[model samples]
Target: RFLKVKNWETDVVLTDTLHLKSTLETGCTEHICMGSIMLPVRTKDQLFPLAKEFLDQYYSSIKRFGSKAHMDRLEEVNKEIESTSTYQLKDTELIYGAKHAWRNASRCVGRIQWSKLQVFDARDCTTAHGMFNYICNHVKYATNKGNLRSAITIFPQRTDGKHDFRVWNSQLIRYAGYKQPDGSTLGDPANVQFTEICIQQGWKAPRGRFDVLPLLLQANGNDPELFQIPPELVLEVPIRHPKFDWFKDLGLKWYGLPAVSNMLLEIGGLEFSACPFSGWYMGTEIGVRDYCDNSRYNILEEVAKKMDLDMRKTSSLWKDQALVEINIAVLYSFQSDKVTIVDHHSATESFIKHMENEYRCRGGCPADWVWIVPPMSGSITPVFHQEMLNYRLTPSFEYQPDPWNTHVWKG
Candidate 1:
């Protein structure tokens, strides 16, 4: 005789508590079929509320920017959240867990914003000197808030299995000032003040002349570029490496790596597009914006150019010593996809239209009179909040084991 399994549940009724209990009990099993059938749905029910709460906190923080001009944007973020249709049974818990991890990771990143420093390679220190002086003046003026202090740091680039100190020395002598011919200062002596010193010593072997001015100054030049030396301008005591301590001995600090990384990313953009692709991994986005808008891109570029001397020297050192070559084509294309440049342009246009309508509605201006140039190429991508979408847009690409793999062209 043949028997059917479906008839066994004909009289069963499932309450919420019973359903949840059964799911939890069966979901923990190592039996693949049984666990897979129940685990995802049970996980979603558990995590949905937590995901919503986390998103609420994240959106609230964005609203703190205090721009009434962004009401439409806020609405759009809300719409996106509402439109997300992913069901509870399809690994939603994993999604929420990943997002939570990302948020936690973001909090651990330490960021320091600093103006770019300019360096000159023309063999004339006057231009470089003038630039450094101007930078100092600006820093002094801005530090009226009393938070700014001088921190002189030396970063040595790797060269042929050794550290190249020549480029660093050139910058040090030019901007930070070195001993004069008569053992006195060349520029204004009284205005100089060295606050904090940092030296990034690389494991690469020394390639060029590393020792130049140890005897010139008593200790490494008070706040010597490299600390762990004496406090005095001249040192009577011998300079010895710190004991087995990685951070102190290497003069490692958190600030140098990211700063230099950003510089190299941009330089790579200029050299070859490939750098932008590499930059995406580093979270560098490239897009066009109004040159006059004082947006983040505009501001960063302006500041960098103002201190171009330092940037140029630093990039050159990285290129010549470190042999780091950035391919611009790759970077540009990678950034285009990573940042979704075209979509951003469309969104900006929509925003301008919305703003115009709002102004006209308020009787502040005629809608026809208000005009914003459609965003051109090179604008920075705008971050969106969860509340701002009318519908979910699928990502252009999905993860695969190997992105570049192609079976059609295989040998």
Candidate 2:
């Protein structure tokens, strides 16, 4: 039975796959990918164009003053994409590509400093122990004691046959969730499934609401290892509202940095399965999406009640009122603690500036208007009015399958 022996497990299945749907946004606001630049040009022959595209752009950006030897080296790298069984990138190539990936991210509204992402190379890390060191370093550096910075820790690429290196935790830092006796939950509902998985993996779920989860790491042929994050490495902003003292009584807070841990970073047809990148939070991400989503905390009605908005009347915009104040509190609290955070107002204006900067520098910028628009307000933001087109460009980042033992959050 010569079935061509397809190793189904090795297939590069994308989680949260992009679907191109722009003409249907009038009735649909949620689950929209404004622009998706797919990797249609992925065959060996197709890879040449991509490599040339990368080298050409990166060459010019870095003041293209190189000798013939440099040009020849670039050619060799290009050829390797087609000829080599497992492709590799030089340090500069990976760094430039990672930065370009952030710049080319269609859904990210925070691309103002896409070129400034700090790159930490960890390709040499071969053991789970080695991975723990690099990720811990990234957390400490990215945390920066409340003054957050944009950065990425690059891991080895996934090869055709060999096992992959991966980080299972959604981030280097996240709060714990404990199920209550009455079927309710405490702490981050978004992290509940992950918290359980870590417990199953023998990490003792903390008794408190804000306990930081440890780093779970795995290399080829290794049992997943758990390393507790030092308390000092995590920077959390204890959320409190400016106007209401009762909001402080709620005891709700979140980490200062959102270090995305599950996205795949693809550069020149090579996929980095474990590249964790982070940016400073936009207030609405925590206020509107993380806490307010129905399946998550579902805090809108309670918050609206706390604000004394007309609960029975939908026209009174109770939800809208709650959103504004919660986001206001988020910004106020972060600013009070001197943590790096951006408000939706400033972020939208900055995105518009980012568009202008991209236009002047790169002719066009592909954006996802749905994601670029803030969760609370749609039409009020500058990005909401503008047209956007999503298309695939590389080196770029993407959502990928969660590593073994992690659960998907439906909300």
TM-score quality measure for candidate 1: 0.16
lDDT string, candidate 1, 174-233, tens digits = 112223467653222221222101112211212221221111111111111221212121
How do the residues 297-356 of candidate 2 rate in per-residue lDDT, one tens digit apiece? 678887888888998979988888888888889999999999999988899888877776
RMSD of model 2 against the true structure: 10.0
Candidate 2 segments exceeding 4 Å error: 1-49, 63-67, 78-84, 179-182, 405-411
TM-score of each: 0.16, 0.84
- Model 1 regions lying over 4 Å from their true place: 1-59, 62-71, 75-411
- True-structure RMSD, every candidate: 27.6, 10.0
Top TM-score hit: 2
Candidate 2 Cα deviation (angstroms), residue 91: 1.3
Clashes of each: 42, 5
